[PDB]
Point group: C4
Chain length 247, copies 4
C-alpha cells in the first residue's frame, strides 16, 4: 500500500503548499494577499493535488474524506491509516516549507516574535483559530456542516452514474468547490474541513516555537477540526447516497 501512501503524501504536500502560502500572503501583506487569494490558493491547490494522485489513490488529501469513503464502504479500512499517515506527513512538511520560504517575512512582520495573536499574529498562517465572536459549539457545527457540503458535492462531481464532471476535468471542478466553500462559508472557522490540513501544521507551529497556546486557544479548539469533519464528511456522503438511492 506504499503506492497510495506516496500519492496521498505528494498530493497533500502540493495542495498544502499552495493553501498555506496563500494564507501567508493574506496575513503578512495586504498588498499581495486577500481572503479571495486564500480561497483560490487552497481551491486550485486541490486541483493540482488531484492531478498528482487522483488516479493512483483518489487524491483524498483529507482524513475526513478517507474516513467517509471507508465508513461508506468504498475504501477498505486497512487503507485508512496509510492514507492519513501520508496526508499528515505531506501537510506537516508543507507547513515546514512555508515557514522556511516565508521566514524573513514572518520575522519582519512580527518583529521576531512568533505570536499566536498579539499585536501581530502569525500562528494563523498554518492552522485555524476561532474568531472571538464564535463559540466552540457553533464552531463544531460549522466544521461538520461545511465538511458535509464538501463530501456531498465531491460525490456529485465524480458520480459516474449521475451527472459528473467530464472525465479529465474533475480536478478543476473539485477545486472550484473548495474555492467557494471558502468564499461562502469560511469566515466563521477558517473552513478547516480537513483534519490533515489543520492538525499537522498546528503541530509544526508548536515545534517551531509558537508555544502551547496553538492547542489551548479558542477553548481547546484544536480537536474540533479533527473530529467535526469526520462526522460531517460521513453525514454528507450518507445524504448523497440516500438521495441517489431514492432517485
Amino acid at each position: 500500500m506504499v503506492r497510495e501512501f506516496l500519492a496521498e503524501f505528494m498530493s497533500t504536500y502540493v495542495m498544502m503548499v499552495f493553501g498555506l502560502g496563500s494564507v501567508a500572503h493574506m496575513v503578512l501583506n495586504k498588498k499581495y494577499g486577500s481572503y479571495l487569494g486564500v480561497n483560490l490558493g487552497f481551491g486550485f491547490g486541490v486541483t493540482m493535488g488531484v492531478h498528482v494522485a487522483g488516479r493512483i489513490s483518489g487524491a483524498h488529501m483529507n482524513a475526513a474524506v478517507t474516513f467517509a469513503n471507508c465508513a461508506l464502504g468504498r475504501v477498505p479500512w486497512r487503507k485508512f491509516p496509510v492514507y492519513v499517515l501520508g496526508q499528515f506527513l505531506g501537510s506537516f512538511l508543507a507547513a515546514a516549507t512555508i515557514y522556511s520560504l516565508f521566514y524573513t517575512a514572518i520575522l519582519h512582520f512580527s518583529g521576531g516574535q512568533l505570536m499566536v495573536t498579539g499585536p501581530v499574529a502569525t500562528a494563523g498562517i498554518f492552522a485555524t483559530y476561532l474568531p472571538d465572536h464564535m463559540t466552540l459549539w457553533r464552531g463544531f457545527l460549522n466544521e461538520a456542516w461545511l465538511t458535509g457540503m464538501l463530501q456531498l458535492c465531491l460525490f456529485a462531481i465524480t458520480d459516474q452514474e449521475n451527472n459528473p464532471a467530464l472525465p479529465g476535468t474533475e480536478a478543476l471542478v473539485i477545486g472550484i468547490l473548495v474555492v467557494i466553500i471558502g468564499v461562502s462559508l469560511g469566515m466563521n472557522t477558517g473552513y478547516a474541513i480537513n483534519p490533515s490540513r489543520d492538525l499537522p501544521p498546528r503541530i509544526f507551529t508548536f515545534i517551531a516555537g509558537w508555544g502551547k497556546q496553538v492547542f489551548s486557544n479558542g477553548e481547546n479548539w484544536w480537536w474540533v477540526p479533527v473530529v467535526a469533519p469526520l462526522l460531517g464528511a460521513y453525514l454528507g456522503g450518507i445524504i448523497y447516497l440516500v438521495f441517489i438511492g431514492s432517485t
Copy 2:
C-alpha cells in the same frame, strides 16, 4: 414525481447555501466578503447544484426557469408544482442553515438586533431589497430583463442543435453565466432572477423575527422577484426560440 422533487430540493439547497453564505460574508465582514465573492458564491453554487440534479430533474433551482420551460412546452405543467415545492423547501432550509451557521456573527454584527436596515442591516443576507435610488417599476424592469438574459443564455449553453457547452462541462459554463449576471447587472436589484431564491428566505427572516418589514420594505418589493422573473424567463426563452427558428 418524487425523483424530480428530491433533485430540485437537493440542488436548490446546495446552491442557496453557497449563495446566501457569500452574501453573509459581504454583509458581515468586509475583510472576508465582497460583491465579487457573492458573484462567485451564487454562480458556482449553481454549478454544484447542476452536478447534483442536472441529469435527474434538469437542476432548474429556479421557479421562473421551470415556468418558462413549461410555458414553452419543454416540461409538462404537472411537474411545475413538484419542482417549485422542492425549490422552495430547499431554499428555505438553506436560509435556516445560514442563519444557524452565522448566528453569532449576525448577533455580534447587529448587537443582537435583527435589523432590516437600520444602523446594521442583516435581512439583506437572505433576500433582496431595493436600493433607495431605485423605483419599483425600474426594479420590475431589471428583474424581468435579467431573468430574460438568464433564460436565453441557459438555452444557448445547453442547445444540442446549436453551439452548446461540451457535455460534462455545462455546469461550469452555467455557473459563469450566473457569475456575470451579478458582475454586470446585479447592483440595481440584487439580481434575484429567481422566485425560489428570494421568497423562501424572505419568509424565513419573517419567521426568524426580522418582522413584517421584510415584505413591505421597498414599496412592497417582495412580490416583484416572484412575478418579474416569471415573465422575463418566458420572454428570454421565446426570444431564443424565435432566434433559432429564424436561423
Copy 3:
C-alpha cells in the same frame, strides 16, 4: 444572409449587455464594481455570445474581427456589411438597454447631469475615452496592438490544425482571452479593440443627450477605436498565418 445577421445581432447584444453593465457597476458604485469586474463582464460576456452565434455566424461580435477574416480570405466580402450591421444594431440596443436598466443609478450618481467627465462622468459607461496621460498617437498604437493580440490568440484558440481548445470549450478560452486583454493592456485606452463595441454606444450617448463632446473629446478620439482595430486585427491575423505557414 439574414442567418448571420441575426446571429451577429443576438451575440453582440448579449456580449455588450454584460460588458457595458460591468462598466456601469465600476463607474457608479465602488462597492459593487471594479476594473476586474469589467474584465470579467466583457470577457465572459464574449463567452455567452460565442454560445449564441458561434456555429451560425462564427460569433465575431467585432467589426475588426470580421474585417480581418474577410481581408485574410476566410469570409466572403459580401458578408462584411451584413455582419457589421448586425453587430452595430445589437451593440446600440445593448447601450439602450443598460441606459434604461441603470437610469436611476445614472441620475442619482450625476445629480441629473449626463456628464462626459465633469464632477461625475457617465459617458464612459458606454464608450472609451482617452485618459489625460495619453496621446492620440499612442492611443492608436494601443488599439492596433491590442486588437492584433486579440486576433492572433483567437486564431490560435480555434486553429484545428495547430493546438486549439477542445471543441465545445472554445467559448470559455476566448472569454479568458478577452478577460486578460483587459487585465494586462486595458488601462491606456479602455481596450475598445472593437469598432462595434465602441461606436454604436457612443452614438447612443450622443442621441441620449450627452452632447457633441462624446466625439470631440480626446482630440477627436472617436474614430481611433474604429480604424486602429481594423488594422490591428488584420496584422495580428497575418502574423499568425505567417507563423503557422513557416512552421
Copy 4:
C-alpha cells in the same frame, strides 16, 4: 529547428506581453491593477502561449522548463539553445512592446524619471527585485522551490500515463497553475520561476536607460532568477519521476 525557435518566440512573446502588462497595471495605477491581476495576467498569458506553441514546440516559454526537460532526457540537448534563444528574443521584444504601449503612463507616473525604486519605481514592471525583508539566500531558496513546484505540477497536468488534464484543456490548467504560484508563493521574490521571463526584460531596462542598478540591486539579484529556476525545475521534475516510478 527553426520550427521550435519560432514557436518558442511567438508563445513567449504573447505570454510576456500579458504578464508584463498586468504588472504595469499594478505598478502604475491602483484603480486598474492589483496583485491578483498580475496573477491572472501571467497565468492565463501562459494559457495563450500554450495554444500558440504547445503542439509545435511544447510551449516551454521558460529556459528552466527546457533545461529540466533536456536534463531529464525528454528533449535533445541540441534544442536547448534554440528554445532559449527564441524565448529570450520573444520576451525581450515583449518588454519593448510594454514599454512603448505604457510609455506615457510610465512618464506621467515617474515625472519623467525612469526610477528603479526611488519615490516611484518602474523598473519592477519588467523584472523582479528582492523586497527588503528578503536575503539573497532565501531568495535563491524561493526561486528554486517555486520552479520545482512548477515543473512537478506541469508534469502531473500533462502526464498521459497518470491523471492528466483532458487533451485540449491542458492550456487552461497550466495557466491556473501559474496563477496560484503567484497567489500562494509570489510575494517573496516576484516568483520569476523563469530565466526567460526575468533576464531579457531586465536587459531591456538597462538599455532603455534605467541604469546599471537593474543588475546590482538586491545584492546582485539578477543572476538568481537565471540559476535558481534551472536547479528547481530539474529537482521538481526528478521528484515527480521518482514519485511515478515508485508507483
